[PDB]
Design a protein around this ligand. Sequence first.
Ligand SMILES: Nc1ncnc2c1ncn2[C@@H]1O[C@H](COP(=O)(O)O)[C@@H](O)[C@H]1O
Ligand SMILES: Nc1ncnc2c1ncn2[C@@H]1O[C@H](COP(=O)(O)O)[C@@H](O)[C@H]1O
Lengths: 102, 112
Amino acid sequence: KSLPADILYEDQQCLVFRDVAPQAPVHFLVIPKKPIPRISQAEEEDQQLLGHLLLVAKQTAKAEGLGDGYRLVINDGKLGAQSVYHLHIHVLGGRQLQWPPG
Amino acid sequence: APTIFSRILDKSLPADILYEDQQCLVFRDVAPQAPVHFLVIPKKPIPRISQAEEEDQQLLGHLLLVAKQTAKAEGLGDGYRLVINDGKLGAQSVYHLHIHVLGGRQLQWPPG
Ligand SMILES: Nc1ncnc2c1ncn2[C@@H]1O[C@H](COP(=O)(O)O)[C@@H](O)[C@H]1O
Ligand SMILES: Nc1ncnc2c1ncn2[C@@H]1O[C@H](COP(=O)(O)O)[C@@H](O)[C@H]1O
């Protein structure tokens, strides 16, 4: 019922795949394999995992040719416009991002 | 290369500080884009997320946990957004790594 996501990267801790509704020419998603539902529900034990996700995001941004710049976004809850209750880090690039960020 | 955040860190220029420990400082944005808008910055002067390294793994995780904890303390219980800008296309203007935390209104999509 959906298209198969291009998985850009995977390791023992996380998965990186393209957003089916891209908000920029490059828009991908970094998710942990541990199903943390929302960033507001991350805990101290997740510290290394969270750092790893950000490192994977910036490494994948380099790989995707986002050297002129990009934006990382994490949405929490209703007011953050979170839609899937598993942690997703958005990486957006390939165009000039605006301010404010929504 | 020091940025204006160096004057925030050394307390020479004023800031509304929400949290501080030996690894980071959290303070309100002076041009807030939401009713609550603050910045979480490392004391280590990493200039941008694209220049973070494997050695920074723990620090990066700490910054996200501090962002999350400060969001709770600021009453953002119905949602919020974390944003990191890198480079010109990301609209980065201050070249000292920071996480924006925005809440207190419905954030829109796309995020800029
Ligand atoms: N079938 C799908 N394949 C790839 N991405 C999806 C799919 N369904 C939803 N998404 C995206 O997953 C993201 C979830 O992030 P969030 O809205 O922050 O929870 C959104 O940007 C969606 O567009
Ligand atoms: N003296 C200051 N105190 C607090 N926030 C500041 C100060 N100078 C600049 N800023 C904010 O720093 C942010 C820089 O974010 P960016 O444009 O993502 O680099 C902007 O939101 C500015 O409003």
